[PDB]
PDB file of C-alpha atoms in Angstrom:
ATOM      1  CA  UNK A   1     -48.756 -63.932  17.412  1.00 27.72           C
ATOM      2  CA  UNK A   2     -50.445 -64.927  14.175  1.00 34.52           C
ATOM      3  CA  UNK A   3     -51.846 -68.348  13.262  1.00 33.01           C
ATOM      4  CA  UNK A   4     -48.942 -69.039  11.242  1.00 33.14           C
ATOM      5  CA  UNK A   5     -46.321 -68.616  14.032  1.00 31.91           C
ATOM      6  CA  UNK A   6     -48.706 -70.337  16.430  1.00 33.03           C
ATOM      7  CA  UNK A   7     -48.674 -73.561  14.273  1.00 36.22           C
ATOM      8  CA  UNK A   8     -45.040 -73.239  13.803  1.00 36.89           C
ATOM      9  CA  UNK A   9     -44.487 -72.924  17.392  1.00 38.04           C
ATOM     10  CA  UNK A  10     -46.508 -75.973  18.150  1.00 42.84           C
ATOM     11  CA  UNK A  11     -44.691 -77.918  15.260  1.00 41.34           C
ATOM     12  CA  UNK A  12     -41.218 -76.754  16.607  1.00 41.08           C
ATOM     13  CA  UNK A  13     -41.867 -77.743  20.235  1.00 40.29           C
ATOM     14  CA  UNK A  14     -43.366 -81.004  19.338  1.00 40.11           C
ATOM     15  CA  UNK A  15     -40.481 -82.017  17.073  1.00 42.35           C
ATOM     16  CA  UNK A  16     -37.866 -80.876  19.697  1.00 37.58           C
ATOM     17  CA  UNK A  17     -39.616 -82.908  22.386  1.00 39.66           C
ATOM     18  CA  UNK A  18     -39.692 -85.964  20.231  1.00 37.50           C
ATOM     19  CA  UNK A  19     -36.005 -85.762  19.388  1.00 37.98           C
ATOM     20  CA  UNK A  20     -35.318 -85.131  23.061  1.00 39.88           C
ATOM     21  CA  UNK A  21     -37.337 -88.463  23.844  1.00 41.71           C
ATOM     22  CA  UNK A  22     -35.274 -90.552  21.343  1.00 44.55           C
ATOM     23  CA  UNK A  23     -32.200 -88.964  22.810  1.00 42.89           C
ATOM     24  CA  UNK A  24     -33.247 -89.769  26.323  1.00 43.84           C
ATOM     25  CA  UNK A  25     -33.829 -93.294  25.205  1.00 45.68           C
ATOM     26  CA  UNK A  26     -30.338 -93.675  23.671  1.00 45.52           C
ATOM     27  CA  UNK A  27     -28.907 -92.444  26.811  1.00 41.59           C
ATOM     28  CA  UNK A  28     -30.764 -94.833  28.907  1.00 44.71           C
ATOM     29  CA  UNK A  29     -29.819 -97.635  26.594  1.00 48.02           C
ATOM     30  CA  UNK A  30     -25.974 -96.578  27.017  1.00 45.72           C
ATOM     31  CA  UNK A  31     -26.701 -96.586  30.898  1.00 43.63           C
ATOM     32  CA  UNK A  32     -28.165-100.368  30.232  1.00 44.62           C
ATOM     33  CA  UNK A  33     -24.914-101.359  28.477  1.00 39.32           C
ATOM     34  CA  UNK A  34     -22.719 -99.867  31.288  1.00 41.61           C
ATOM     35  CA  UNK A  35     -24.972-101.777  33.631  1.00 44.18           C
ATOM     36  CA  UNK A  36     -24.497-105.097  32.264  1.00 46.26           C
ATOM     37  CA  UNK A  37     -20.923-104.414  31.466  1.00 48.17           C
ATOM     38  CA  UNK A  38     -20.374-103.851  35.269  1.00 45.61           C
ATOM     39  CA  UNK A  39     -22.477-106.932  35.358  1.00 44.10           C
ATOM     40  CA  UNK A  40     -19.502-108.807  33.798  1.00 44.75           C
ATOM     41  CA  UNK A  41     -16.853-107.420  36.086  1.00 46.69           C
ATOM     42  CA  UNK A  42     -15.539-104.412  34.300  1.00 48.50           C
ATOM     43  CA  UNK A  43     -14.543-100.911  35.453  1.00 50.11           C
ATOM     44  CA  UNK A  44     -17.155 -98.439  34.144  1.00 48.81           C
ATOM     45  CA  UNK A  45     -14.840 -95.340  35.029  1.00 51.07           C
ATOM     46  CA  UNK A  46     -11.931 -96.953  33.011  1.00 53.22           C
ATOM     47  CA  UNK A  47     -14.465 -97.998  30.342  1.00 49.32           C
ATOM     48  CA  UNK A  48     -15.558 -94.384  29.799  1.00 51.39           C
ATOM     49  CA  UNK A  49     -11.893 -93.370  29.993  1.00 53.53           C
ATOM     50  CA  UNK A  50     -11.330 -95.650  26.878  1.00 56.96           C
ATOM     51  CA  UNK A  51     -14.369 -94.258  25.134  1.00 55.52           C
ATOM     52  CA  UNK A  52     -13.095 -90.579  25.804  1.00 52.07           C
ATOM     53  CA  UNK A  53      -9.475 -91.306  24.692  1.00 55.59           C
ATOM     54  CA  UNK A  54     -10.714 -93.230  21.410  1.00 57.46           C
ATOM     55  CA  UNK A  55     -12.478 -90.002  20.492  1.00 57.99           C
ATOM     56  CA  UNK A  56      -9.198 -87.935  20.742  1.00 59.68           C
ATOM     57  CA  UNK A  57      -6.421 -87.734  18.141  1.00 59.63           C
ATOM     58  CA  UNK A  58      -3.891 -90.394  18.824  1.00 59.84           C
ATOM     59  CA  UNK A  59      -0.804 -88.207  18.062  1.00 58.08           C
ATOM     60  CA  UNK A  60      -2.181 -85.381  20.137  1.00 57.53           C
ATOM     61  CA  UNK A  61      -2.961 -87.962  23.014  1.00 57.80           C
ATOM     62  CA  UNK A  62       0.395 -89.441  23.005  1.00 55.31           C
ATOM     63  CA  UNK A  63       1.596 -86.041  22.793  1.00 55.12           C
ATOM     64  CA  UNK A  64      -0.220 -85.037  25.828  1.00 54.00           C
ATOM     65  CA  UNK A  65       0.836 -88.253  27.565  1.00 53.61           C
ATOM     66  CA  UNK A  66       4.559 -87.443  26.787  1.00 53.85           C
ATOM     67  CA  UNK A  67       4.243 -83.920  27.871  1.00 56.34           C
ATOM     68  CA  UNK A  68       2.316 -85.264  30.999  1.00 56.32           C
ATOM     69  CA  UNK A  69       5.130 -87.740  31.804  1.00 55.51           C
ATOM     70  CA  UNK A  70       7.773 -84.908  31.413  1.00 59.96           C
ATOM     71  CA  UNK A  71       6.004 -82.674  33.720  1.00 60.93           C
ATOM     72  CA  UNK A  72       5.571 -85.232  36.343  1.00 59.64           C
ATOM     73  CA  UNK A  73       9.357 -86.072  36.218  1.00 59.30           C
ATOM     74  CA  UNK A  74      10.301 -82.380  35.921  1.00 61.97           C
ATOM     75  CA  UNK A  75       8.838 -82.004  39.571  1.00 64.71           C
ATOM     76  CA  UNK A  76       9.768 -85.094  41.099  1.00 67.26           C
ATOM     77  CA  UNK A  77       6.063 -86.022  41.810  1.00 67.02           C
TER      78      UNK A  77
ATOM     79  CA  UNK B   1      -7.052-110.905  30.226  1.00 67.06           C
ATOM     80  CA  UNK B   2      -8.808-114.079  28.804  1.00 65.84           C
ATOM     81  CA  UNK B   3     -10.252-114.423  25.311  1.00 65.69           C
ATOM     82  CA  UNK B   4     -13.836-114.099  26.595  1.00 63.91           C
ATOM     83  CA  UNK B   5     -13.304-110.798  28.464  1.00 66.19           C
ATOM     84  CA  UNK B   6     -11.395-109.527  25.272  1.00 65.37           C
ATOM     85  CA  UNK B   7     -14.329-110.206  23.137  1.00 64.21           C
ATOM     86  CA  UNK B   8     -16.789-108.859  25.595  1.00 61.39           C
ATOM     87  CA  UNK B   9     -14.577-105.726  25.926  1.00 59.30           C
ATOM     88  CA  UNK B  10     -14.590-105.344  22.129  1.00 62.92           C
ATOM     89  CA  UNK B  11     -18.403-105.813  21.972  1.00 65.94           C
ATOM     90  CA  UNK B  12     -19.123-103.432  24.935  1.00 66.50           C
ATOM     91  CA  UNK B  13     -16.950-100.843  23.309  1.00 65.29           C
ATOM     92  CA  UNK B  14     -18.519-101.109  19.901  1.00 60.84           C
ATOM     93  CA  UNK B  15     -22.002-101.016  21.169  1.00 56.65           C
ATOM     94  CA  UNK B  16     -21.337 -97.912  23.255  1.00 56.81           C
ATOM     95  CA  UNK B  17     -19.644 -96.279  20.453  1.00 54.33           C
ATOM     96  CA  UNK B  18     -22.623 -96.821  18.123  1.00 49.88           C
ATOM     97  CA  UNK B  19     -25.278 -95.757  20.861  1.00 47.23           C
ATOM     98  CA  UNK B  20     -22.910 -92.472  21.067  1.00 49.04           C
ATOM     99  CA  UNK B  21     -23.229 -92.026  17.300  1.00 48.24           C
ATOM    100  CA  UNK B  22     -26.797 -92.183  17.261  1.00 50.32           C
ATOM    101  CA  UNK B  23     -27.095 -89.946  20.238  1.00 49.89           C
ATOM    102  CA  UNK B  24     -25.093 -87.590  18.231  1.00 49.62           C
ATOM    103  CA  UNK B  25     -26.948 -87.783  15.228  1.00 49.50           C
ATOM    104  CA  UNK B  26     -30.247 -86.826  17.488  1.00 47.92           C
ATOM    105  CA  UNK B  27     -28.263 -83.915  18.961  1.00 44.23           C
ATOM    106  CA  UNK B  28     -27.389 -82.789  15.671  1.00 45.29           C
ATOM    107  CA  UNK B  29     -31.078 -82.970  14.269  1.00 46.38           C
ATOM    108  CA  UNK B  30     -31.996 -81.028  17.243  1.00 47.76           C
ATOM    109  CA  UNK B  31     -29.609 -78.170  16.525  1.00 49.08           C
ATOM    110  CA  UNK B  32     -31.064 -78.331  12.719  1.00 46.17           C
ATOM    111  CA  UNK B  33     -34.481 -77.729  14.047  1.00 45.24           C
ATOM    112  CA  UNK B  34     -33.421 -74.981  16.391  1.00 39.28           C
ATOM    113  CA  UNK B  35     -31.595 -73.670  13.305  1.00 38.18           C
ATOM    114  CA  UNK B  36     -34.561 -73.504  10.957  1.00 39.85           C
ATOM    115  CA  UNK B  37     -36.543 -72.368  14.019  1.00 41.53           C
ATOM    116  CA  UNK B  38     -34.260 -69.338  14.210  1.00 41.57           C
ATOM    117  CA  UNK B  39     -34.624 -69.317  10.515  1.00 43.01           C
ATOM    118  CA  UNK B  40     -38.286 -68.457  11.113  1.00 44.95           C
ATOM    119  CA  UNK B  41     -37.542 -65.501  13.505  1.00 42.30           C
ATOM    120  CA  UNK B  42     -37.995 -67.240  16.907  1.00 42.13           C
ATOM    121  CA  UNK B  43     -35.878 -66.559  20.015  1.00 41.08           C
ATOM    122  CA  UNK B  44     -34.091 -69.795  20.416  1.00 38.97           C
ATOM    123  CA  UNK B  45     -33.041 -69.050  24.243  1.00 41.27           C
ATOM    124  CA  UNK B  46     -36.831 -68.568  25.012  1.00 40.36           C
ATOM    125  CA  UNK B  47     -37.646 -71.739  23.178  1.00 37.72           C
ATOM    126  CA  UNK B  48     -35.154 -73.730  25.322  1.00 38.35           C
ATOM    127  CA  UNK B  49     -36.784 -72.020  28.401  1.00 41.49           C
ATOM    128  CA  UNK B  50     -40.248 -73.245  27.117  1.00 40.36           C
ATOM    129  CA  UNK B  51     -38.811 -76.757  26.715  1.00 41.85           C
ATOM    130  CA  UNK B  52     -37.229 -76.636  30.088  1.00 38.65           C
ATOM    131  CA  UNK B  53     -40.297 -75.349  31.923  1.00 38.12           C
ATOM    132  CA  UNK B  54     -42.508 -77.992  30.088  1.00 40.13           C
ATOM    133  CA  UNK B  55     -40.484 -80.681  31.753  1.00 36.02           C
ATOM    134  CA  UNK B  56     -41.030 -79.291  35.221  1.00 36.56           C
ATOM    135  CA  UNK B  57     -44.174 -79.999  37.346  1.00 32.88           C
ATOM    136  CA  UNK B  58     -46.530 -77.118  36.755  1.00 32.90           C
ATOM    137  CA  UNK B  59     -47.656 -76.908  40.507  1.00 32.99           C
ATOM    138  CA  UNK B  60     -43.915 -76.775  41.625  1.00 34.30           C
ATOM    139  CA  UNK B  61     -43.196 -74.241  38.698  1.00 34.25           C
ATOM    140  CA  UNK B  62     -45.928 -72.150  39.557  1.00 30.36           C
ATOM    141  CA  UNK B  63     -44.805 -72.258  43.112  1.00 28.51           C
ATOM    142  CA  UNK B  64     -41.282 -71.191  42.373  1.00 32.11           C
ATOM    143  CA  UNK B  65     -42.791 -68.472  40.407  1.00 35.70           C
ATOM    144  CA  UNK B  66     -44.949 -67.391  43.322  1.00 34.90           C
ATOM    145  CA  UNK B  67     -42.027 -67.815  45.736  1.00 34.84           C
ATOM    146  CA  UNK B  68     -39.839 -65.826  43.276  1.00 32.39           C
ATOM    147  CA  UNK B  69     -42.153 -63.028  42.817  1.00 33.86           C
ATOM    148  CA  UNK B  70     -42.653 -62.914  46.594  1.00 35.78           C
ATOM    149  CA  UNK B  71     -39.015 -62.633  47.152  1.00 35.91           C
ATOM    150  CA  UNK B  72     -38.485 -60.024  44.594  1.00 36.93           C
ATOM    151  CA  UNK B  73     -41.330 -57.871  46.010  1.00 37.53           C
ATOM    152  CA  UNK B  74     -39.969 -58.704  49.547  1.00 38.68           C
ATOM    153  CA  UNK B  75     -36.654 -56.821  48.966  1.00 39.81           C
ATOM    154  CA  UNK B  76     -37.941 -54.182  46.597  1.00 42.84           C
ATOM    155  CA  UNK B  77     -35.826 -55.373  43.873  1.00 42.86           C
TER     156      UNK B  77
ATOM    157  CA  UNK C   1     -43.551 -61.671  53.890  1.00 42.61           C
ATOM    158  CA  UNK C   2     -42.965 -59.668  57.301  1.00 44.36           C
ATOM    159  CA  UNK C   3     -40.438 -57.042  57.336  1.00 45.09           C
ATOM    160  CA  UNK C   4     -38.124 -59.220  59.475  1.00 44.32           C
ATOM    161  CA  UNK C   5     -37.973 -61.896  56.698  1.00 46.06           C
ATOM    162  CA  UNK C   6     -37.838 -58.881  54.084  1.00 47.69           C
ATOM    163  CA  UNK C   7     -34.530 -57.486  55.790  1.00 48.46           C
ATOM    164  CA  UNK C   8     -33.086 -61.147  56.411  1.00 50.71           C
ATOM    165  CA  UNK C   9     -33.684 -61.936  52.673  1.00 51.52           C
ATOM    166  CA  UNK C  10     -31.977 -58.683  51.761  1.00 52.34           C
ATOM    167  CA  UNK C  11     -29.027 -59.620  53.939  1.00 55.53           C
ATOM    168  CA  UNK C  12     -28.825 -63.329  52.515  1.00 56.59           C
ATOM    169  CA  UNK C  13     -29.002 -62.002  48.927  1.00 55.90           C
ATOM    170  CA  UNK C  14     -26.025 -59.809  49.525  1.00 55.95           C
ATOM    171  CA  UNK C  15     -24.105 -62.385  51.270  1.00 55.95           C
ATOM    172  CA  UNK C  16     -24.454 -64.684  48.475  1.00 52.07           C
ATOM    173  CA  UNK C  17     -23.652 -61.942  45.864  1.00 49.69           C
ATOM    174  CA  UNK C  18     -20.538 -61.125  47.636  1.00 50.92           C
ATOM    175  CA  UNK C  19     -19.344 -64.667  47.804  1.00 51.58           C
ATOM    176  CA  UNK C  20     -20.135 -65.103  44.192  1.00 52.26           C
ATOM    177  CA  UNK C  21     -17.991 -61.849  43.357  1.00 51.51           C
ATOM    178  CA  UNK C  22     -14.907 -63.316  45.352  1.00 50.95           C
ATOM    179  CA  UNK C  23     -15.373 -66.593  43.543  1.00 53.88           C
ATOM    180  CA  UNK C  24     -15.451 -64.790  40.114  1.00 54.53           C
ATOM    181  CA  UNK C  25     -12.164 -63.206  41.398  1.00 54.62           C
ATOM    182  CA  UNK C  26     -10.527 -66.467  42.093  1.00 55.78           C
ATOM    183  CA  UNK C  27     -11.553 -67.613  38.497  1.00 60.12           C
ATOM    184  CA  UNK C  28     -10.251 -64.748  36.761  1.00 60.08           C
ATOM    185  CA  UNK C  29      -6.888 -65.016  38.572  1.00 59.91           C
ATOM    186  CA  UNK C  30      -6.621 -68.735  37.784  1.00 58.78           C
ATOM    187  CA  UNK C  31      -7.295 -67.645  34.163  1.00 59.19           C
ATOM    188  CA  UNK C  32      -4.445 -65.214  34.389  1.00 63.98           C
ATOM    189  CA  UNK C  33      -2.045 -67.704  35.954  1.00 64.97           C
ATOM    190  CA  UNK C  34      -2.691 -70.257  33.041  1.00 64.19           C
ATOM    191  CA  UNK C  35      -2.361 -67.362  30.651  1.00 64.02           C
ATOM    192  CA  UNK C  36       1.186 -66.688  32.347  1.00 66.42           C
ATOM    193  CA  UNK C  37       1.859 -70.554  31.962  1.00 65.73           C
ATOM    194  CA  UNK C  38       1.184 -70.518  28.254  1.00 63.16           C
ATOM    195  CA  UNK C  39       3.326 -67.341  28.014  1.00 59.81           C
ATOM    196  CA  UNK C  40       6.307 -69.431  28.950  1.00 60.58           C
ATOM    197  CA  UNK C  41       5.488 -72.152  26.523  1.00 60.56           C
ATOM    198  CA  UNK C  42       3.675 -74.726  28.784  1.00 59.71           C
ATOM    199  CA  UNK C  43       0.599 -76.839  27.704  1.00 57.79           C
ATOM    200  CA  UNK C  44      -2.461 -75.319  29.739  1.00 56.04           C
ATOM    201  CA  UNK C  45      -4.584 -78.580  29.015  1.00 58.44           C
ATOM    202  CA  UNK C  46      -1.786 -80.794  30.444  1.00 59.34           C
ATOM    203  CA  UNK C  47      -1.200 -78.537  33.414  1.00 56.93           C
ATOM    204  CA  UNK C  48      -4.739 -78.662  34.221  1.00 59.27           C
ATOM    205  CA  UNK C  49      -4.404 -82.504  33.809  1.00 60.01           C
ATOM    206  CA  UNK C  50      -1.848 -82.404  36.408  1.00 62.82           C
ATOM    207  CA  UNK C  51      -3.706 -80.301  38.752  1.00 63.88           C
ATOM    208  CA  UNK C  52      -6.610 -82.548  38.538  1.00 61.62           C
ATOM    209  CA  UNK C  53      -4.814 -85.916  38.980  1.00 64.66           C
ATOM    210  CA  UNK C  54      -3.041 -84.543  42.098  1.00 64.50           C
ATOM    211  CA  UNK C  55      -6.381 -84.290  43.717  1.00 66.19           C
ATOM    212  CA  UNK C  56      -6.988 -87.953  43.310  1.00 64.32           C
ATOM    213  CA  UNK C  57      -5.446 -90.613  45.133  1.00 68.37           C
ATOM    214  CA  UNK C  58      -1.918 -91.581  43.673  1.00 69.69           C
ATOM    215  CA  UNK C  59      -2.455 -95.450  44.356  1.00 70.08           C
ATOM    216  CA  UNK C  60      -5.739 -95.155  42.576  1.00 72.88           C
ATOM    217  CA  UNK C  61      -4.472 -93.153  39.833  1.00 77.50           C
ATOM    218  CA  UNK C  62      -1.625 -95.507  38.970  1.00 79.91           C
ATOM    219  CA  UNK C  63      -4.075 -98.267  39.442  1.00 81.20           C
ATOM    220  CA  UNK C  64      -6.568 -96.768  36.902  1.00 78.49           C
ATOM    221  CA  UNK C  65      -3.646 -96.002  34.531  1.00 79.58           C
ATOM    222  CA  UNK C  66      -2.702 -99.692  34.848  1.00 78.07           C
ATOM    223  CA  UNK C  67      -6.400-100.916  34.098  1.00 79.61           C
ATOM    224  CA  UNK C  68      -6.607 -98.492  31.341  1.00 77.27           C
ATOM    225  CA  UNK C  69      -3.235 -99.653  29.799  1.00 76.85           C
ATOM    226  CA  UNK C  70      -4.470-103.307  30.255  1.00 77.83           C
ATOM    227  CA  UNK C  71      -7.770-102.571  28.441  1.00 78.17           C
ATOM    228  CA  UNK C  72      -6.080-100.804  25.606  1.00 78.84           C
ATOM    229  CA  UNK C  73      -3.537-103.480  25.096  1.00 81.09           C
ATOM    230  CA  UNK C  74      -6.396-106.082  25.392  1.00 83.86           C
ATOM    231  CA  UNK C  75      -7.806-104.377  22.259  1.00 86.27           C
ATOM    232  CA  UNK C  76      -4.693-102.931  20.712  1.00 85.76           C
TER     233      UNK C  76
ATOM    234  CA  UNK D   1      13.196 -80.256  30.802  1.00 85.72           C
ATOM    235  CA  UNK D   2      16.040 -77.866  32.330  1.00 84.63           C
ATOM    236  CA  UNK D   3      16.312 -77.209  36.048  1.00 82.87           C
ATOM    237  CA  UNK D   4      14.866 -73.602  35.614  1.00 80.85           C
ATOM    238  CA  UNK D   5      11.819 -74.911  33.857  1.00 82.92           C
ATOM    239  CA  UNK D   6      11.513 -77.604  36.469  1.00 80.50           C
ATOM    240  CA  UNK D   7      11.402 -75.041  39.500  1.00 83.23           C
ATOM    241  CA  UNK D   8       9.197 -72.790  37.476  1.00 83.74           C
ATOM    242  CA  UNK D   9       6.871 -75.592  36.770  1.00 84.91           C
ATOM    243  CA  UNK D  10       6.760 -76.316  40.574  1.00 86.39           C
ATOM    244  CA  UNK D  11       5.931 -72.731  41.193  1.00 87.34           C
ATOM    245  CA  UNK D  12       3.034 -72.823  38.699  1.00 88.36           C
ATOM    246  CA  UNK D  13       1.592 -76.014  39.996  1.00 88.78           C
ATOM    247  CA  UNK D  14       1.830 -74.792  43.560  1.00 86.69           C
ATOM    248  CA  UNK D  15       0.139 -71.476  42.602  1.00 82.30           C
ATOM    249  CA  UNK D  16      -2.785 -73.062  40.699  1.00 80.34           C
ATOM    250  CA  UNK D  17      -3.271 -75.667  43.661  1.00 80.94           C
ATOM    251  CA  UNK D  18      -3.423 -72.682  46.289  1.00 82.41           C
ATOM    252  CA  UNK D  19      -5.874 -70.911  44.220  1.00 86.41           C
ATOM    253  CA  UNK D  20      -8.049 -73.949  43.789  1.00 88.38           C
ATOM    254  CA  UNK D  21      -8.018 -74.499  47.599  1.00 91.00           C
ATOM    255  CA  UNK D  22      -9.345 -70.871  47.877  1.00 90.55           C
ATOM    256  CA  UNK D  23     -11.953 -71.533  45.412  1.00 91.73           C
ATOM    257  CA  UNK D  24     -12.795 -74.619  47.306  1.00 94.53           C
ATOM    258  CA  UNK D  25     -13.205 -72.557  50.508  1.00 89.00           C
ATOM    259  CA  UNK D  26     -15.593 -70.228  48.696  1.00 90.93           C
ATOM    260  CA  UNK D  27     -17.694 -72.979  47.451  1.00 95.90           C
ATOM    261  CA  UNK D  28     -17.872 -74.636  51.029  1.00 94.34           C
ATOM    262  CA  UNK D  29     -18.875 -71.205  52.556  1.00 93.55           C
ATOM    263  CA  UNK D  30     -21.633 -70.686  49.860  1.00 96.66           C
ATOM    264  CA  UNK D  31     -22.947 -74.138  50.745  1.00 96.34           C
ATOM    265  CA  UNK D  32     -22.957 -73.216  54.350  1.00 92.09           C
ATOM    266  CA  UNK D  33     -24.723 -69.923  53.440  1.00 90.88           C
ATOM    267  CA  UNK D  34     -27.519 -71.799  51.478  1.00 92.32           C
ATOM    268  CA  UNK D  35     -27.877 -74.079  54.317  1.00 92.73           C
ATOM    269  CA  UNK D  36     -28.197 -71.208  56.750  1.00 91.38           C
ATOM    270  CA  UNK D  37     -30.930 -69.957  54.339  1.00 88.16           C
ATOM    271  CA  UNK D  38     -32.968 -73.021  54.399  1.00 88.45           C
ATOM    272  CA  UNK D  39     -32.525 -73.352  57.986  1.00 88.68           C
ATOM    273  CA  UNK D  40     -34.688 -70.288  58.143  1.00 85.97           C
ATOM    274  CA  UNK D  41     -37.493 -71.671  55.834  1.00 89.40           C
ATOM    275  CA  UNK D  42     -36.197 -70.259  52.474  1.00 89.55           C
ATOM    276  CA  UNK D  43     -36.337 -71.897  49.106  1.00 91.31           C
ATOM    277  CA  UNK D  44     -32.641 -72.417  48.083  1.00 91.98           C
ATOM    278  CA  UNK D  45     -33.434 -73.148  44.566  1.00 90.49           C
ATOM    279  CA  UNK D  46     -35.534 -69.968  44.242  1.00 92.42           C
ATOM    280  CA  UNK D  47     -32.793 -68.051  46.152  1.00 92.39           C
ATOM    281  CA  UNK D  48     -30.173 -69.278  43.506  1.00 90.49           C
ATOM    282  CA  UNK D  49     -32.775 -68.218  40.861  1.00 91.26           C
ATOM    283  CA  UNK D  50     -32.710 -64.702  42.217  1.00 90.34           C
ATOM    284  CA  UNK D  51     -29.014 -64.590  42.399  1.00 92.29           C
ATOM    285  CA  UNK D  52     -28.494 -65.814  38.887  1.00 94.43           C
ATOM    286  CA  UNK D  53     -31.323 -63.360  37.305  1.00 95.83           C
ATOM    287  CA  UNK D  54     -29.826 -60.571  39.336  1.00 99.23           C
ATOM    288  CA  UNK D  55     -26.587 -60.984  37.163  1.00100.32           C
ATOM    289  CA  UNK D  56     -28.441 -60.689  34.022  1.00 98.82           C
ATOM    290  CA  UNK D  57     -29.619 -57.368  32.552  1.00 97.22           C
ATOM    291  CA  UNK D  58     -33.132 -56.397  34.182  1.00 95.52           C
ATOM    292  CA  UNK D  59     -34.762 -55.029  30.756  1.00 96.99           C
ATOM    293  CA  UNK D  60     -33.734 -58.065  28.855  1.00 95.42           C
ATOM    294  CA  UNK D  61     -34.715 -60.310  31.858  1.00 98.66           C
ATOM    295  CA  UNK D  62     -38.289 -58.859  31.896  1.00100.09           C
ATOM    296  CA  UNK D  63     -38.173 -58.943  27.899  1.00100.36           C
ATOM    297  CA  UNK D  64     -37.264 -62.438  28.020  1.00 97.82           C
ATOM    298  CA  UNK D  65     -40.040 -63.147  30.608  1.00100.96           C
ATOM    299  CA  UNK D  66     -42.520 -61.239  28.342  1.00102.87           C
ATOM    300  CA  UNK D  67     -41.527 -63.311  25.188  1.00100.93           C
ATOM    301  CA  UNK D  68     -41.897 -66.562  27.408  1.00 99.06           C
ATOM    302  CA  UNK D  69     -45.172 -65.653  28.557  1.00 97.90           C
ATOM    303  CA  UNK D  70     -46.108 -64.551  24.860  1.00 96.84           C
ATOM    304  CA  UNK D  71     -45.187 -68.126  23.719  1.00 96.65           C
ATOM    305  CA  UNK D  72     -46.691 -69.969  26.530  1.00 99.36           C
ATOM    306  CA  UNK D  73     -50.176 -68.070  25.987  1.00 98.12           C
ATOM    307  CA  UNK D  74     -49.765 -68.828  22.234  1.00100.16           C
ATOM    308  CA  UNK D  75     -49.698 -72.479  23.111  1.00103.58           C
ATOM    309  CA  UNK D  76     -51.773 -72.095  26.162  1.00103.24           C
TER     310      UNK D  76
END
């Protein structure tokens, strides 16, 4: 490669690595939060469920819940 | 639940949501970096490959490369 | 390597590849099944949800649903 | 729903569940195969690497390896 692409390559790699570090840090902090959360007697799986359903559209969520209920009753299961 | 667990639940949820936001932001920034990187004529897949192999132990990496080469030659493929 | 390990390696690789092919077939067929499911006006995502929750223990399922609802009501 | 869609739903669910079971069998067998592979002193990860790279086009594989090496040499 040329000197330009060499320096650009080093730059890109370094910036990406830094961002990955910050990202990893955030992830670890989240894990810490869930750890103390479990440290207060909360169900982490259910908490993650709440987080997952609070990102979804409420209308489509309640829709999928209604359809779900419908399907479960439709088969007797 | 009791008022304590209610407030703690709200707190946990809010903090986790914030951390998720920061995390998402970091991810988006990474995507931006790879976008301008591709904007300079670089192979993003290969870049990700470099990032992935720069996290691994060099000794075990070169090991797996030697073993790989060995296996490929062993079968004529 | 020695010739023995070479032939054995070829064997292993072939075995794994064949199993991977069969796995691919299964996945493709499943894809076709869900396509047939939506072709009759069914929600594929919800169907997958039904399948995934039928793998879980029912008592723990209705339990986790109860805890979920409890928390959601706790925060509105 | 109507009785027809109820029976059809039962059918679909059963079909999907059976396919999932067969898929599980395939995965379990693969697990057994790699266990047999390491039982003869082979690197399972590297074997999986061989399998995964044999799915890719060889020209593009050796090409991506060349670009990789080029970049790594470019940065040492």
